[PDB]
Design an enzyme around this catalytic site. Structure first.
Site, mmCIF file in Angstrom:
data_model
loop_
_atom_site.group_PDB
_atom_site.id
_atom_site.type_symbol
_atom_site.label_atom_id
_atom_site.label_comp_id
_atom_site.label_asym_id
_atom_site.label_seq_id
_atom_site.Cartn_x
_atom_site.Cartn_y
_atom_site.Cartn_z
ATOM 1 N N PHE A 1 -5.955 5.033 7.513
ATOM 2 C CA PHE A 1 -5.357 4.073 8.172
ATOM 3 C C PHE A 1 -6.140 3.275 9.153
ATOM 4 C CE2 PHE A 1 -1.882 7.382 7.067
ATOM 5 C CZ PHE A 1 -1.038 6.412 6.222
ATOM 6 N N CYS B 1 -3.695 1.356 11.658
ATOM 7 C CA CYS B 1 -2.444 1.002 10.960
ATOM 8 C C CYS B 1 -1.289 1.359 12.058
ATOM 9 C CB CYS B 1 -1.993 1.830 9.918
ATOM 10 S SG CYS B 1 -0.458 1.182 9.060
ATOM 11 N N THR C 1 0.771 -1.304 0.020
ATOM 12 C CA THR C 1 0.046 0.050 -0.046
ATOM 13 C C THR C 1 0.852 1.572 0.057
ATOM 14 O OG1 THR C 1 -0.018 -0.203 2.317
ATOM 15 C CG2 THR C 1 -1.860 -0.905 0.958
HETATM 16 C C1 HEM Z 1 0.404 4.228 3.094
HETATM 17 C C2 HEM Z 1 0.329 2.655 3.329
HETATM 18 C C3 HEM Z 1 -0.351 2.217 4.201
HETATM 19 C C4 HEM Z 1 -1.775 2.161 4.166
HETATM 20 C C5 HEM Z 1 -2.709 3.126 3.505
HETATM 21 C C6 HEM Z 1 -2.114 1.101 5.234
HETATM 22 C C7 HEM Z 1 -3.638 0.855 5.619
HETATM 23 C C8 HEM Z 1 -3.734 0.080 6.593
HETATM 24 C C9 HEM Z 1 -5.160 0.222 7.092
HETATM 25 C C10 HEM Z 1 -6.519 0.738 6.423
HETATM 26 C C11 HEM Z 1 -5.200 -0.803 8.114
HETATM 27 C C12 HEM Z 1 -6.417 -1.325 9.022
HETATM 28 C C13 HEM Z 1 -6.992 -2.700 8.480
HETATM 29 C C14 HEM Z 1 -8.265 -3.067 8.918
HETATM 30 O O1 HEM Z 1 -8.839 -2.250 9.652
HETATM 31 O O2 HEM Z 1 -8.669 -4.201 8.737
HETATM 32 C C15 HEM Z 1 -3.735 -1.135 8.595
HETATM 33 C C16 HEM Z 1 -3.352 -2.040 9.517
HETATM 34 C C17 HEM Z 1 -1.966 -2.489 9.591
HETATM 35 N N1 HEM Z 1 -0.939 -2.021 8.980
HETATM 36 FE FE1 HEM Z 1 -0.955 -0.481 7.690
HETATM 37 N N2 HEM Z 1 -0.999 0.539 5.869
HETATM 38 C C18 HEM Z 1 0.107 1.171 5.230
HETATM 39 C C19 HEM Z 1 1.515 1.063 5.584
HETATM 40 C C20 HEM Z 1 1.743 0.224 6.519
HETATM 41 C C21 HEM Z 1 3.356 -0.263 6.974
HETATM 42 C C22 HEM Z 1 4.366 0.572 6.498
HETATM 43 C C23 HEM Z 1 3.102 -1.053 7.795
HETATM 44 C C24 HEM Z 1 4.308 -2.107 8.366
HETATM 45 C C25 HEM Z 1 5.345 -1.529 8.676
HETATM 46 C C26 HEM Z 1 1.858 -1.459 8.273
HETATM 47 C C27 HEM Z 1 1.337 -2.547 9.090
HETATM 48 C C28 HEM Z 1 0.126 -2.578 9.370
HETATM 49 C C29 HEM Z 1 -0.291 -3.975 10.170
HETATM 50 C C30 HEM Z 1 0.902 -4.679 11.033
HETATM 51 C C31 HEM Z 1 -1.786 -3.588 10.392
HETATM 52 C C32 HEM Z 1 -2.367 -4.234 11.604
HETATM 53 C C33 HEM Z 1 -2.569 -3.518 12.834
HETATM 54 C C34 HEM Z 1 -3.217 -4.052 13.997
HETATM 55 O O3 HEM Z 1 -4.638 -4.543 13.861
HETATM 56 O O4 HEM Z 1 -2.590 -4.181 15.157
HETATM 57 N N3 HEM Z 1 0.966 -0.683 7.345
HETATM 58 N N4 HEM Z 1 -2.924 -0.418 7.604
#
Ligand code: HEM
Ligand SMILES: CCCCCCCCCCCCCCCC(=O)NCC(=O)O
Length: 455
Positions: free
Chosen positions: A393, A400, A268
């Site tokens: 996010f 996120c 993403t």
């Molecule tokens: C611009 C880029 C990114 C976008 C738009 C994005 C978007 C999201 C979204 C919308 C969620 C929520 C998912 C849900 O509710 O089902 C999320 C969760 C998460 N994201 Fe990101 N993400 C991005 C970059 C990253 C990066 C760089 C990492 C890793 C280092 C990452 C790691 C995670 C993880 C591990 C979760 C789970 C969090 C939890 O439930 O504890 N994301 N992200």
């Protein structure tokens, strides 16, 4: 006061399922929303959900005390290889909270300051490649953003070099990732998932999964015996104990977290950069303004952590991009107990709601009439943005965890790109958004003319 929820053409037992039948689902769901208003019901074989588009309703949906994160069919399928990894696990499963307390400390202002130098390493490679192109050549943006974001996460999170800039075609892991994700998105269509016809898919799915695993094996193998005097994500992943259980993440889980972070940690972010550059070339003045910033702040051969944080406008371009096309189109929630949404739509304990983020980011009662116009200036005063109107996010505790990591990287890379090159939309590219759960600009290519600045 009750008003009942509308919904798209029924179409027999297959449910609303046929309303989609496309490789661009989310974009179809957006159109549907343009017709049915702030909310509508969507049914399918053995599952039902409500799609939300207004900040009015989504603001309530974001109430943690009423709704918790739900694993949509999408994440359910995506779980076939991700398992109980932070992104695909339930809020209650031991694993989530356990991993959350163990990994979160790897995203502090401290760890970040440590990552920067690594982010630059990979950032320099991307600038170098472009600097070394011949006049008759061009750049395949998404393809190169994917090389970057992927290599960045691998280096920063596991001290493993994927060396994507030394490969002619997408690293084997990527080929399998996009195929597994595509398989999952398409599986939401399949009316009868086990019927023979799809024997190829199953055969190939177990394969792509093996590819990813082999990659993990090699990473949890390289660390096994080298200068393990580094304390990064993988470190606190094998030497991390939950401060409320004294129990570290077991083997089976540590595996899922890696596969989890390698995908969620670049895919993403790759899209963000791609859409950002897309909007910059189609909006010359805006690109100009940002170029002005990048040069005015980035005055050294390489950017310093501080200088990136100073790239205010660049950061605004990134949000405006995430506004129009959040590379993670939607997240879902379910009612924790029985309740009424927006005081009109009654819900039952368990019922799930779906957040159509792209539409949310287009509510004219929040942004105005020029919703389709790309204006970074909208994020001039972040304090003024209404609560829960901008959610690229996710939400709350299940939001996120990599947000800052992603935005810092994208800001760094975009700032440098803008510092070192002039860009040209040499084919007058027509935006073609490819869907594989996530969103990215398919076939977006440009030419870059160096400003000839060292490093
Ligand atoms: C611009 C880029 C990114 C976008 C738009 C994005 C978007 C999201 C979204 C919308 C969620 C929520 C998912 C849900 O509710 O089902 C999320 C969760 C998460 N994201 Fe990101 N993400 C991005 C970059 C990253 C990066 C760089 C990492 C890793 C280092 C990452 C790691 C995670 C993880 C591990 C979760 C789970 C969090 C939890 O439930 O504890 N994301 N992200
Ligand atoms: C660690 C693994 C991370 C994987 C990232 C997955 C991306 C998250 C975006 C989820 C998008 C869900 C989109 C659902 C839209 C859709 O097709 N709805 C129809 C349906 O569900 O039947």
């Amino acid at each position: 006061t009750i008003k009942e929820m509308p919904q798209p053409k029924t179409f027999g037992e297959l449910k609303n399922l046929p309303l989609l039948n496309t490789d661009k689902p989310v974009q179809a769901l957006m159109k549907i929303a343009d017709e049915l208003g702030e909310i509508f019901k969507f049914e399918a074989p053995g599952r039902v959900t409500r799609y939300l588009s207004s900040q009015r309703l989504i603001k309530e949906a974001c109430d943690e005390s009423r709704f918790d994160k739900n694993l949509s069919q999408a994440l359910k399928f995506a779980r076939d290889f991700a398992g109980d990894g932070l992104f695909t696990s339930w809020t209650h499963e031991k694993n989530w909270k356990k991993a959350h307390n163990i990994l979160l400390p790897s995203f502090s202002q401290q760890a970040m300051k440590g990552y920067h130098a690594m982010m630059v390493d990979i950032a320099v490679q991307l600038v170098q490649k472009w600097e070394r192109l011949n006049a008759d050549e061009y750049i395949e943006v998404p393809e190169d953003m994917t090389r970057l974001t992927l290599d960045t996460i691998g280096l920063c999170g596991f001290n493993y070099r994927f060396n994507s800039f030394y490969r002619d075609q997408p690293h084997p892991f990527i080929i399998s990732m996009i195929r597994a994700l595509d398989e999952v998105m398409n599986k939401l269509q399949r009316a009868n998932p086990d019927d023979p016809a799809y024997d190829e898919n199953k055969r190939q799915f177990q394969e792509d999964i093996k590819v990813m695993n082999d990659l993990v094996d090699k990473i949890i193998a390289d660390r096994k015996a080298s200068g393990e005097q580094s304390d990064d994500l993988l470190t606190q992943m094998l030497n991390g104990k939950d401060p409320e259980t004294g129990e570290p993440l077991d083997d089976g889980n540590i595996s899922y977290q890696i596969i989890t972070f390698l995908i969620a940690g670049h895919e993403t972010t790759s899209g963000l950069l791609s859409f950002a550059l897309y909007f910059l070339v189609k909006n010359p003045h805006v690109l100009q303004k940002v170029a002005e910033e990048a040069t005015r702040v980035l005055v050294d051969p390489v950017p310093s952590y501080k200088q990136v944080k100073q790239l205010k406008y660049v950061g605004m371009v990134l949000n405006e991009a995430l506004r129009l096309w959040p590379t993670a189109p939607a997240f879902s929630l379910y009612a924790k107990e029985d309740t009424v949404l927006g005081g009109e739509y009654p819900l039952e304990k368990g019922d799930e709601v779906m957040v159509l983020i792209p539409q949310l980011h287009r509510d004219k009662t929040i942004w105005g009439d020029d919703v389709e116009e790309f204006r970074p200036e909208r994020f001039e005063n972040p304090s003024a943005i209404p609560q829960h109107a901008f959610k690229p996010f996710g939400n709350g505790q299940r939001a996120c965890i990599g947000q800052q990591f992603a935005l810092h990287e994208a800001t760094l890379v975009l700032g440098m790109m803008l510092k070192h090159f002039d860009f040209e939309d040499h084919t007058n590219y027509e935006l073609d958004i490819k869907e594989t759960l996530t969103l990215k600009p398919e076939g977006f290519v440009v030419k870059a003319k160096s400003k000839k600045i060292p490093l």
